[PDB]
Amino acid sequence: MPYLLISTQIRMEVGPTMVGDEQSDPELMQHLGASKRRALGNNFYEYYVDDPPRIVLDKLERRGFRVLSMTGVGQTLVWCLHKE
Template identity: 50%
Template sequence: MPYMMISTLIRLETGPTYVGDAKSDPVLMNHLEATLTKEPGQIFEVYRTPLLPREVLNRLEKKGWKVIAVTGVGETCIWTLHRV
């Protein structure tokens, strides 16, 4: 899967960081110390890590992922990454 989105609430320095959904690569999710959880009010499961967004981005860069876009939506910051 060549694309990934990660997100966090606007308080970037504290996490948690959301790094995938139920169909994400479990080996990569393990590398990011992420666990599959279902957030209150959601109908789907997401991978969540206690790592800060900066730590997640650093780990993903070492695995060949590059940030291609960043945006803010409400109180959420979202990064889109791509791996060739």
């Protein structure tokens, strides 16, 4: 599983940070301290952490991931990481 997508809403200084979908690696989610939930209004499960994205990026780097790209879409900041 080389690619990873993480995100946060505007105010990058604060969480939550979305770190996965239903088919995400459960061990990686457990390592990040992520919890699984289906938020009201969504028809899908997600993994999230209370940490701001900077903490998550440092945690993932210690797991071989590297930020390939970062973008804004609406009020969301998204990071695309690749295991390398």
